[PDB]
Structure formats: structure tokens, C-alpha cells
């Protein structure tokens, strides 16, 4: 919760998870894939993560030491989601963060690559991006048409993929 030093030195410890906690399948996803699939792991693993922050709340002082069962719980289901999308829409999902690896991860960059993915995951993995807190008669901003902030350079692959989504009638 604090920025680093004048001259901080990094350090690590070659030790292990000692006795009781079994090993987990720890998320080996870099920022751009998990940022892309953030809505879907928030959609499927909603009450699990909600339980996580609830249990971290009620464990005042215990905190970190209490909910190890739950840190085991909430990561694994997200790993299940990303493995299912590794099997599901790996071309288009990868393409979404092939676009999103530029633009400083600004989500404003890759609308045309995004809407191709929204049909795909809702087809096979049958999940959906939903923005909570958005009261009705208010357009969700990745659903709207003619945005004000149009991005800098759309990638060359997903624009052709978008045209082919129109020609195949998948859109």
C-alpha cells in the first residue's frame, strides 16, 4: 500500500508452503489476458470472490491467516474459466489482447475486437459481460454505437476478422 524507496533492494526467500495448505493451480496469466477475461471470471466466480472479501472482512486481525481454504477456492474457479476459454475462443480472445497489448491497456482501443468475442463466449461458454451498478435507461458503453473516443489505430487482423464476422453472419 505504499510506493518504494530511495534505494530499495528486492529480496526473496526460497521456502515453501509449510504443512497444511495443499498446492493450487496458481494463475499463470499475464495482465492482458486476465484483463480481457476479467468480466467473465467476475461473472462466473461472483459469489466466490464476494465470499472472499466477506471472510477477509469478518476476520479482523486474523485476515490473511484465516481464509486460506478460500484463497484456494477463488483462484481455482478463475483458472477453470481461463482454461475453458483456452479451449473455447483462443483465437479471438488472444486477438483481443493482441490488440490490447498496445494502447497502454486502455480499454478504449479495441471495441471491434471486443464485440467479436462477446458473441463467442456467450455461444460456447455461455457467459456474458454485465456492468452492475448501471441503472437502466443508460447504455453500457461497450454496447453503444458511434463512440466519441474512437481509438488510435485498430489492429489490422481484427478489423478483417470483424468484416468476416459480418460476411459469415456470426455478428
Amino acid at each position: 500500500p505504499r510506493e518504494a524507496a530511495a534505494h530499495w533492494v528486492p529480496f526473496e526467500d526460497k521456502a515453501n508452503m509449510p504443512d497444511n495448505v495443499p498446492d493450487v493451480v496458481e494463475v499463470g496469466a499475464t495482465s492482458a489476458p486476465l484483463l480481457s477475461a476479467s468480466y467473465f471470471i467476475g461473472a462466473k466466480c461472483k459469489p466466490y470472490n464476494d465470499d472472499f472479501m466477506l471472510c477477509r472482512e469478518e476476520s479482523q486481525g486474523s485476515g490473511a491467516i484465516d481464509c486460506l481454504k478460500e484463497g484456494r477456492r477463488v483462484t481455482r474457479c478463475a483458472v477453470s474459466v481461463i482454461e475453458d476459454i483456452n479451449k473455447s475462443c483462443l483465437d479471438e480472445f488472444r486477438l483481443h489482447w493482441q490488440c490490447l497489448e498496445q494502447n497502454n491497456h486502455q480499454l478504449s482501443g479495441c471495441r471491434k475486437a471486443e464485440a467479436l468475442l462477446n458473441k463467442c463466449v456467450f455461444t460456447k461458454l455461455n457467459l456474458e459481460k454485465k456492468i452492475p451498478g448501471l441503472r437502466p435507461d443508460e447504455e453500457p458503453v461497450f454496447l453503444k454505437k458511434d463512440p466519441w473516443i474512437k481509438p488510435a489505430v485498430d489492429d489490422f487482423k481484427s478489423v478483417r476478422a470483424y468484416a468476416e464476422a459480418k460476411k459469415n453472419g456470426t455478428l
Binding site: 500500500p1 505504499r2 510506493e3 518504494a4 524507496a5 530511495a6 534505494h7 530499495w8 533492494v9
Partner: protein, 138 residues
């Protein structure tokens, strides 16, 4: 990269060096010429401690107004065992870079807005006073 370690202990001594030249100066303006360097060493110490914000705040206001103000006046004369590396974690609770400056702008405006409101009268007094003195109306 062990030369990196003593950075802070550089600028402390360079501070101690500088202040001696404040209180040992022939001319008046030579003293403030050392003093602006003391402000700069201070701002580098603020950048080195981890407040890059206030380093430049001071350059805007100390060697911005008040030093240059002192220069402007002094022109107008006629004739001359705590050695423990603290451990820093990483938590993911923050969501947006509400930096130090944002939260100043929140506490000055919500929690303690009355201080800024009376500070308006202090800045009022800064206007009235020099006009209260240096004018001789009619």
C-alpha cells in the same frame, strides 16, 4: 550499485554544508544565493524520499515566488542505531491513482474545508497589508 545506498546521506551533509554559508556571507544577496541552493537540495531530498510531488511544489512556490521575492527586495538598496530495512508489501486494494495530490484535494475540501475557507482570509490579508502600508492614500 552500493554507491546507491548512501544517497540520502549525501544530501544531508550537503545541507549542513550549505547552511554555514547562509550565516557567513559578506553581502546580503550572497546569502540568499546559497539559500536557493538549499531549497534545491531540499527538493532533491523530497524526490529521493519518495515524494516527487512536493519536490516540484516547492520549486513552484519557494524558488518560485518567495525566493525571487527576496531577491527582488534585496536588489532595492541604495549603496552597499536505527539500521533496519523496513519491509514493504504489495496490496491490490487501490483501484485508481488517487495520488497524494488527489487526497490533499479531498481532505482540504471535505474533511477540513473550513481550514481552506479561513485560509481565504489569510490570503485576503496578504492583499490588504501591503496596500495597508506602502500606499499613503491621498
Amino acid at each position: 550499485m552500493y554507491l546507491t545506498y548512501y544517497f540520502i546521506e549525501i544530501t544531508i551533509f550537503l545541507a549542513i554544508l550549505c547552511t554555514i554559508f547562509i550565516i557567513s556571507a559578506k553581502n546580503p544577496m550572497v546569502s540568499i544565493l546559497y539559500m536557493i541552493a538549499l531549497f534545491v537540495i531540499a527538493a532533491m531530498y523530497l524526490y529521493l524520499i519518495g515524494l516527487g510531488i512536493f519536490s516540484l511544489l516547492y520549486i513552484m512556490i519557494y524558488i518560485g515566488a518567495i525566493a525571487v521575492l527576496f531577491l527582488f527586495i534585496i536588489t532595492l538598496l541604495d549603496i552597499n542505531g536505527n539500521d533496519y530495512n523496513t519491509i514493504i508489501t504489495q496490496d491490490w486494494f487501490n483501484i485508481e491513482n488517487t495520488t497524494l495530490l488527489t487526497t490533499i484535494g479531498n481532505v482540504l475540501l471535505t474533511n477540513n474545508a473550513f481550514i481552506l475557507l479561513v485560509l481565504a482570509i489569510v490570503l485576503l490579508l496578504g492583499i490588504i497589508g501591503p496596500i495597508s502600508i506602502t500606499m499613503k492614500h491621498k
